[PDB]
């Protein structure tokens, strides 16, 4: 370029530390800048280099995703897989955990992949060698899927049963709630007085969820509210109706769930139990596999326990449809969530309505004393 590239061959005898600076190729600065005429000769000599060098003298079948993931999982627990193969075969509740096998079945490759491994030992990798061990067990895919039953079947019943028993308890409590009937009568008669001479004059009943819509109705003064008026009215001359929130205690548990969710969960459990019966017939029953009765006799108590989940959930349909006719609404346009969460919001809003009444009364008493 600009006659300024006399590259100096050095070739040090001993390798030195190499500082990494940002490279300046002789193009951007070569034209006209600083350092074009560096006097390298006035510094170059043989003593300095001798002194300077003194101080600074120096997987065959598995794909990419599963091969590393399987190797990681095997070292995660760090225990021989032959025993683990015995754990799943013998169903040892100690070593086996839910977390251990849920990601295990994810680690299983396609059922074909484990086949040639048995037909084809130390040369292969830790994931490949473990592939042979798991592939030996007949019907691998259904077997572990059969293992993920007692770790959930016992869990499913205890998770759902408080939800199942809470809905009916609220229904029976609401069935005998006389205070709710007294409160409902007050709104209907009072509401008909305001609706006279209109499209809703003399209405002999109204749809559910209207009680929470009473707050949206205001008065001549914005402070007063129609729902608050009922709260103020009852505390004056019609007591004993403020106890309806206490009459219902399982409001929050039942409203949080719906019968539709339980139907789907129960349907899946039927399918899960169906796989075992096919497995038992397909795989006849030993010493090698201690699962023997741990799964088929589990069904014997599972079917007994699953049976009790049918009639009681059937008691939901019998009681809710009767409750649906009680409030005049089919169990198709309105479900457990929509019907009851609306009522639960009414319970919270009624207590707040009577709370602001006490707060409003306190200011009234404060000014009367003053």
């Amino acid at each position: 370029p600009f006659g300024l590239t006399p590259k100096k061959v050095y070739k040090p005898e001993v390798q030195l530390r190499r500082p990494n600076w940002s490279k300046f190729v002789a193009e951007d600065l070569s034209q006209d800048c600083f350092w074009t005429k560096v006097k390298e000769d006035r510094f170059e000599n043989n003593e300095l280099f001798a002194k300077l060098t003194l101080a600074f003298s120096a997987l065959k079948v598995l794909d990419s995703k599963t091969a590393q993931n399987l190797s990681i999982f095997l070292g995660s627990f760090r225990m021989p897989y032959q025993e683990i193969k015995n754990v799943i075969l013998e169903v040892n509740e100690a070593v086996l955990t839910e977390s251990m096998i849920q990601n295990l079945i994810k680690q299983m490759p396609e059922p074909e992949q484990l086949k040639m491994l048995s037909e084809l030992y130390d040369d292969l990798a830790e994931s490949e060698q473990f592939g042979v061990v798991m592939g030996t067990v007949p019907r691998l895919r259904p077997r572990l899927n059969a293992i993920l039953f007692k770790l959930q079947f016992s869990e499913q019943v205890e998770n759902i049963k408080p939800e199942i028993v809470s809905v009916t308890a609220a229904c029976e409590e609401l069935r005998k709630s006389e205070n709710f009937s007294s409160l409902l009568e007050l709104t209907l008669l009072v509401g008909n007085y305001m609706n006279a001479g209109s499209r809703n004059a003399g209405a002999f009943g109204f749809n559910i969820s209207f009680l929470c819509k009473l707050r949206d109705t205001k008065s001549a003064d914005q402070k007063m509210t129609l729902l608050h008026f009922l709260a103020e009215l009852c505390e004056n001359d019609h007591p004993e109706v403020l106890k309806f929130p206490d009459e219902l205690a399982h409001v929050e548990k039942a409203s949080r769930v719906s019968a539709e969710n339980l139907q789907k969960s129960l349907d899946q459990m039927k399918k899960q139990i169906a796989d075992v019966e096919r497995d038992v017939q397909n795989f006849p029953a030993d010493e090698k596999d201690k699962f023997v009765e741990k799964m088929t006799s589990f069904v014997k108590d599972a079917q007994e326990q699953y049976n009790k989940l049918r009639m009681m959930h059937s008691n939901m349909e019998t009681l809710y449809k009767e409750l649906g006719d009680y409030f005049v609404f089919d169990p198709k346009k309105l479900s457990v969530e929509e019907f009851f969460m609306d009522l639960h919001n009414f319970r919270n809003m009624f207590l707040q309505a009577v709370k602001e009444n006490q707060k409003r009364r306190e200011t009234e008493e404060k000014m009367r004393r003053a």
Binding site: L59, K65, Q68, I72, S76, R78, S99, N103, N261
Partner: protein, 370 residues
């Protein structure tokens, strides 16, 4: 004989590959005396690093070389590594490859500097750097999930998939142990106890690590604490004085879930896990939602699993299922995962060997270890 070193803001865990527990777990603090050494003969070695600084902390300036994950002093960091390799581990890194850990979303400058320190000051034959949050799942068995990583200076929720962290879904929260310890001092003054110097910081840290739990609810717990004195606990200072904390037990870790107490606009660790999930794909959301894995010492408050699960329920969809997982090795989760990774037979491939480091300089760490 691979070595694994996990550098952290509060503590540093070191040991050997293939082990189950770290060989040395000592605080990452460098202290120097501030007074005058009137005693002749002894009193030398003004650089106290590791456990020695903790024992003599009454006459030392306790300075943390790491703050908020980023290194604020690269001189004493070399001291800590020198202390770890020669004092705690008693091994020469001249023949032992070393694996390190890095924080999520680390600056590119800090990571490249660590390569030079290993390869020049200690000249290890090989070195690798891995993400801190990814190693949590390698230790937790599963290869997919979301790591609610926490610690002394950083709090990261990194929803990895197949062992590769998703970059766009990582959310960083500036709320970790050190802020919790500092908040404890501010609220402790309300009773009459004051801690100012860094020597008394360890006293407040020890109080936090023993007598603080996470309350499921506050609308009733606050009334319980004021009404009754059943929740009070007593702690003894090294001076021998008796202090009773009481109400401030649960108000120190609750800053994690309500950072508005500290005056920070960012939402709690319960809400950042939610938002980090939505940034991921819809199809993969099913697996990560039920596979949440905690990590870091900041997540060792009793009652953290049930509190986070309850809070994460209302924001989660009703059909969705949530399972917060708390392995027993939360404190050392990010270390054992590195032990699992290094012990693999396939880990020899992507070593950053010394021979290939000189050819590509320190820039090789950007294209080799990713």
């Amino acid at each position: 004989a691979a070595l694994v070193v996990d550098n952290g803001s509060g503590m540093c865990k070191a040991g050997f590959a293939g082990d189950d527990a770290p060989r040395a777990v000592f605080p990452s603090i460098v202290g120097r005396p501030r007074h005058q050494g009137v005693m002749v003969g002894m009193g030398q070695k003004d650089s106290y690093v590791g456990d020695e600084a903790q024992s003599k902390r009454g006459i030392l300036t306790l300075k943390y070389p790491i703050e908020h994950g980023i290194v604020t002093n690269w001189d004493d960091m070399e001291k800590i590594w020198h202390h770890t390799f020669y004092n705690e581990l008693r091994v020469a890194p001249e023949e032992h490859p070393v694996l390190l850990t890095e924080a999520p979303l680390n600056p590119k400058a800090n990571r490249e500097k660590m390569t030079q320190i290993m390869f020049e000051t200690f000249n290890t034959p090989a070195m690798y750097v891995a993400i801190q949050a990814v190693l949590s799942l390698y230790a937790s068995g599963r290869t997919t999930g979301i790591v609610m990583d926490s610690g002394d200076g950083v709090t990261h929720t990194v929803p990895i998939y197949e062992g590769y962290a998703l970059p766009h879904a990582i959310l960083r929260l500036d709320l970790a142990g050190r802020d919790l310890t500092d908040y404890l001092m501010k609220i402790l003054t309300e009773r009459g106890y004051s801690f100012t110097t860094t020597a008394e910081r360890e006293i407040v840290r020890d109080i936090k690590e023993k007598l603080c739990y996470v309350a499921l609810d506050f609308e009733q717990e606050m009334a319980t604490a004021a009404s009754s004195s059943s929740l009070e606990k007593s702690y003894e200072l090294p001076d021998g004085q008796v202090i009773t904390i009481g109400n401030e037990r649960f108000r120190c870790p609750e800053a994690l879930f309500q950072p508005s107490f500290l005056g920070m606009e960012s939402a709690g660790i319960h809400e950042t896990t939610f938002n980090s999930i939505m940034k991921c794909d819809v199809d993969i959301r099913k697996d990560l939602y039920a596979n949440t894995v905690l990590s870091g010492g900041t997540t060792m408050y009793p009652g953290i699993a049930d509190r986070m699960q309850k809070e994460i329920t209302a924001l989660a969809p009703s059909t969705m299922k949530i399972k917060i997982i708390a392995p027993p090795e939360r404190k050392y989760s990010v270390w054992i995962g590195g032990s699992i990774l290094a012990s693999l037979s396939t880990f020899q491939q992507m070593w950053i060997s010394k021979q290939e480091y000189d050819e590509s300089g320190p820039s090789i760490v950007h294209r080799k270890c990713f």
